[model samples]
Target: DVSGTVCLSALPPEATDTLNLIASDGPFPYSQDGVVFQNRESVLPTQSYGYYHEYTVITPGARTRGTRRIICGEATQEDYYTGDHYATFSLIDQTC
Candidate 1:
């Protein structure tokens, strides 16, 4: 999972033009190089804060004999006027 203040100053000129084209048409094709950014704007003082967590597990024999794995990550955005908390957990099929 991902948790943080995702900020974007502004879309480039080319990106803005591409967005206009997509708006006139429809969603761009879902390709590796498909349009990602669209016409958007945000004023200063824009901020956010929150907590996030994630968990994953791999069981033995899933990929190979006696294999085991686990992964997790989390981040909290900075909030000036609030408190945040986050947590997560996961279980794996040990039998595989």
Candidate 2:
């Protein structure tokens, strides 16, 4: 089995966003391939919400050590907005 932490920071002001920590491999709970795992909708007042929110990703049984991309972004806006403001991190199975 393997596990680790994920963090996010530097958000816009008064922007209500959703934070998702999804695993792209492995099994259920450990992998979000076919399921919705972590969803933090409505992250309002982004400036004041500067901190690292942690989550644990577990891999069951023996699996090949590969790279899993951790994607994060803000909620889609109905009005004029740009979606380029986001971040992503990579997690290696061997380190987990």
Candidate 3:
């Protein structure tokens, strides 16, 4: 209920890379890239179960999947970015 908005340009380059891959039916870097987002924290707007899908944002020096992620709502085609592994989310604003 308290999500913020982030301009697309403000995001890390890796985020945009993931976004592009999402659009193109990616040969994704992670096997879990397109999996459903369970929204266990309930930080985002409520929606039907399994309505959001997640994509990973590659971090330069992380050994495993880092905390950053891009989540997209299937119902509304809305996109969000999380640098802290779902602790918070920011709606991606293309025109910001």
Candidate 4:
């Protein structure tokens, strides 16, 4: 149940780029970059089965999409992210 706030500038460049891409609605680099986030861990607040969606947070050294990601919903205004493969999440509020 890790909880905190992270500034967009503080995240890895790739992550911020991915976040931006999410707002753009794609041209994602990976075929699986955008997909449904089932919320199997229940770490984040409740939402419908397909209400939440996810995008890669792009790791610096990992060969694959890695464990990091940006979980978003209905709109880009609110979202969540997990660095430990859905073990936990941080709500991404558009404003401070």
Candidate 4's error at 51, in angstroms? 0.9
What TM-score would each prediction reach against the true structure? Answer: 0.20, 0.18, 0.91, 0.84
Better structure of 1 and 4 per lDDT: 4
**How far off is residue 44 in model 3, in Å?**
1.1
Question: Which candidate should be chosen as best, given lDDT against the real structure?
Answer: 3
Clashes of 2: 1
Q: Please, what are the lDDT tens digits per residue for candidate 4 over residues 46-91?
A: 7788888888888877898899888887755667777888887777
Considering lDDT, where higher is better, how would the candidates rank from best to worst?
3, 4, 2, 1
Worst lDDT 10-window in candidate 2: 77-86
93 Cα displacement, candidate 3 (Å): 1.0
Tens-digit per-residue lDDT, 1-96, candidate 3:
547788989999898899889999899999998999888778888888889899999999999999999999885548999998788888898676
Give the Cα lDDT of each candidate. 0.23, 0.26, 0.87, 0.77
Q: Is candidate 1 or candidate 3 better by lDDT?
A: 3
**Model 4 accuracy (lDDT, Cα):** 0.77
Alpha-carbon RMSD to native, per candidate: 18.7, 15.0, 1.4, 2.0
Worst lDDT run of 10 residues, candidate 4, spans 1-10
Off by over 4 Å in 1: 1-9, 26-96
Which structure among the candidates has the greatest TM-score?
3
Write the residue-wise lDDT of candidate 1 on 1-96 in tens digits: 223231211312333333343336434322322222111221112223212111111122344211111111122221110011122212212122
Number of clashes in every candidate structure?
Answer: 0, 1, 0, 0
lDDT of 2 by residue, 1-96 (tens): 112232223222211122232223223333333332232343222322322222222222426312222232223311111222212332222121
